[PDB]
Design a protein around this ligand. Sequence first.
Ligand SMILES: N=C(NO)NCCC[C@H](N)C(=O)O
Ligand SMILES: N=C(NO)NCCC[C@H](N)C(=O)O
Ligand SMILES: N=C(NO)NCCC[C@H](N)C(=O)O
Ligand SMILES: [Mn+2]
Ligand SMILES: [Mn+2]
Ligand SMILES: [Mn+2]
Ligand SMILES: [Mn+2]
Ligand SMILES: [Mn+2]
Ligand SMILES: [Mn+2]
Lengths: 313, 313, 313
Amino acid sequence: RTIGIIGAPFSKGQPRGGVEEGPTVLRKAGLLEKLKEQECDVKDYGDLPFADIPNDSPFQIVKNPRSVGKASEQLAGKVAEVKKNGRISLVLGGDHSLAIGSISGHARVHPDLGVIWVDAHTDINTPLTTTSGNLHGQPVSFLLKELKGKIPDVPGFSWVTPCISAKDIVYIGLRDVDPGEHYILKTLGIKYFSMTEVDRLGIGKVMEETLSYLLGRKKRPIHLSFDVDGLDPSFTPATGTPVVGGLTYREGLYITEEIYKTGLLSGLDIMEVNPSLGKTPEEVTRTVNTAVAITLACFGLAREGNHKPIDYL
Amino acid sequence: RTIGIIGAPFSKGQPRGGVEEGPTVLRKAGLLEKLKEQECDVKDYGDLPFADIPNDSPFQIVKNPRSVGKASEQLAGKVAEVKKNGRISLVLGGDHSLAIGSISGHARVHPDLGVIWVDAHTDINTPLTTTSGNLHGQPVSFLLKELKGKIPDVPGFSWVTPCISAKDIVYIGLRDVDPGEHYILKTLGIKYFSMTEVDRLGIGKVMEETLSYLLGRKKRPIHLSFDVDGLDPSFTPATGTPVVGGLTYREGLYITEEIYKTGLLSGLDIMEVNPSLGKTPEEVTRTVNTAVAITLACFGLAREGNHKPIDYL
Amino acid sequence: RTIGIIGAPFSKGQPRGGVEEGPTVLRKAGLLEKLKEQECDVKDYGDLPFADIPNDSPFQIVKNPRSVGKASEQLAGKVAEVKKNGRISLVLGGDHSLAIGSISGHARVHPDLGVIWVDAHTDINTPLTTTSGNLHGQPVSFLLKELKGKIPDVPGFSWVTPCISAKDIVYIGLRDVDPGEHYILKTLGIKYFSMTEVDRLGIGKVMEETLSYLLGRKKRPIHLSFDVDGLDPSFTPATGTPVVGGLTYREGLYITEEIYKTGLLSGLDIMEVNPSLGKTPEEVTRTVNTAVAITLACFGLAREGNHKPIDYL
Ligand SMILES: N=C(NO)NCCC[C@H](N)C(=O)O
Ligand SMILES: N=C(NO)NCCC[C@H](N)C(=O)O
Ligand SMILES: N=C(NO)NCCC[C@H](N)C(=O)O
Ligand SMILES: [Mn+2]
Ligand SMILES: [Mn+2]
Ligand SMILES: [Mn+2]
Ligand SMILES: [Mn+2]
Ligand SMILES: [Mn+2]
Ligand SMILES: [Mn+2]
């Protein structure tokens, strides 16, 4: 098919600023070239210009609600467009609060989408359950229909419309979930594979079940929101909220290779890469290199190798 | 249920001294608070006062037999008491020679106990098979009934009484077993899962089989003796006898999460943590943090999250 | 049985020179002693004297063809001899181009041999498909019968005779395969387990299938060509072409333990160990120690322990 790259240098969904450099370091890693180097048709819609909102005091506990609501709103429009151009949207973040706009925009063109959320967190806190007030830990609550009604009128998000059901999403990699978040998981019956299930079943069965769970009834567009902190910090240290005991480099590549093979990948998010938090220059390149590898895998790069339909001998 | 914490700052079961600091660094890591932070009822019986035995020459090859026999004897009494108070005994070590007293004391109140021994070693050498003479590598030989008769009259252990059968114990994590020790394993028919079986089956099946092996016939109290060197040294370097190729942080957490879910955990040992052997200050905190994580997992902390029986929305 | 050690200090199959020190650092690690320490009958045929070929300009793109062809030719003779002495040949390399001579020499005495190739690469490029021109990435092409006819008359290799069929070899560990190489894999129907299959099935099933694939029809001599870069570089960094996401120390030991248990190990190669490329002195010892461990495992050393047929009690 074809790809649609869109940079989202946004950080207001959380405290640390370095995350807005994500699009920059990833593009610098030669992402667009590496992709073209494969059988990929790439179109870059550029880095979105996120208007500065000086007047943005908290809503109760929630911080920078207008800036986050605006950035997600803009992204949504940008994603819907690339999708209306028949391309796989690739959002380079940026903090995870942007998923509100990415999945929202994506669902405008494909309302029957299925979401796979690779993360160490569920990011399903509501404005009233959150304790940090950071919006990169609440995106999923704004997207679920079952939750519509537990979400107050938060400045900046009146454009939002819950576009996914509790049963159109699967979490993979969870190892740090808050109490209120766990309650929602169990109460709404969300399908998830915490690190415990990954250890018990193995990443092969997990993927088998995940794809089976979302594509059993029928085939439909797949959206992959990949938070780099889903992988163990020994692979991706340059990120804001790292948690030990995460998915390995291999497991990260396995997940994406399996998604590509479905041929249903429709939208992709690579979030939470923060070059400023790398304890060393090598820690930064280690994070960017791994993030790039996962992305290339999403678009065909296989560990067993690739070859064009021709006779090489 | 409820917990009973007891510190065992003892090192004479082996050469390096730093191990007696175990209770200190673990408590400093905020273990008692973290536990209370969960649905845990914690009672600390304090650090046991281990009397100094100046006159303790070797028995043949065996070193500090009187000091080890005395410390294990005292611990046994302390454990039996906390158990008679209806609490899960948590012994903070200290070298592994203390397991003689811990399992002994535990079996006084619950003679039908089952033991799961996570270690890189089997610690089943006899005074006559040991080559090091260090008692932290012989505890299991003093506890088995099948071996009663191959154990000489060692100064300090005339109070001991073999309280477990060869079929009431399962080893997990073995990767450094002496020749004589292997002979005993095969001769007595002890159930074990070396690193080879873990690689072959996966930690999920291993736990399935372990719990099935010990709880098949009927449900009974479970005693977990956790040696931190069972985990690969990249996770727990601050320990006396580290061996490469050990259990991962994840596998360590998987084992303990599964044990908790049985609801049969009765006694727990966290041994061989030596702050003095950490090549760096980070190596020490890395070891203590991991040791604390395994402990919290033993008492309920789940990677998928936890929540109280209440409506969070 | 018995072992036949032969050092192959050769590097001309690739650019970096340090690799010729392989036999030296491995022997220095006390390999011969550690082996004898087991129930092993060891005979060292010494390090082969590789004649200097000053006049060796490229053949098209292929570099040092005469030196490589000569060294492999000599090795072949040396291996056939040790095999005619009823011993398991152990070739200490040296770059992987030597496998041409090792498998060739081995097949002279045992034409029905089966090959297990642990590597991050397939080393199956032909003189015409290679892009590097380095011969350590083409050995397999000179050995297959299905390919005989796609290989030009390369100076130094007129002594070669394809001795194995596409179905007498299994790859394990692949994660960096060129386009032309992938074409050959799929076209000839070669059985391989890339890192993707290892993640999907687990190393236990992979070995089950590998041994089943090569020994299903009937039992036959097994040749194991072990490239140290098959293992992740966190275990073997001192090597020329390291690739992230490789086999773990444990998986490396699992493969070799399973091969030993077959009792069919006939020939073994330990290649690509380059002491000069270790970023630190510890990186060098880490690589040599792991390489030695894999070797000892090939000859009986088990993680669950070993014991002689005698009563230890
Ligand atoms: N980076 C993330 N998620 O990906 N942060 C969310 C963090 C933790 C916590 N649950 C919160 O809402 O603050
Ligand atoms: N720390 C331990 N075990 O946990 N040490 C025992 C070590 C090795 C050897 N088996 C011995 O008896 O000396
Ligand atoms: N060390 C090895 N293999 O083990 N090098 C081969 C490398 C890469 C590439 N395929 C080539 O032919 O250059
Ligand atoms: Mn996230
Ligand atoms: Mn996260
Ligand atoms: Mn122990
Ligand atoms: Mn141990
Ligand atoms: Mn190779
Ligand atoms: Mn290689």
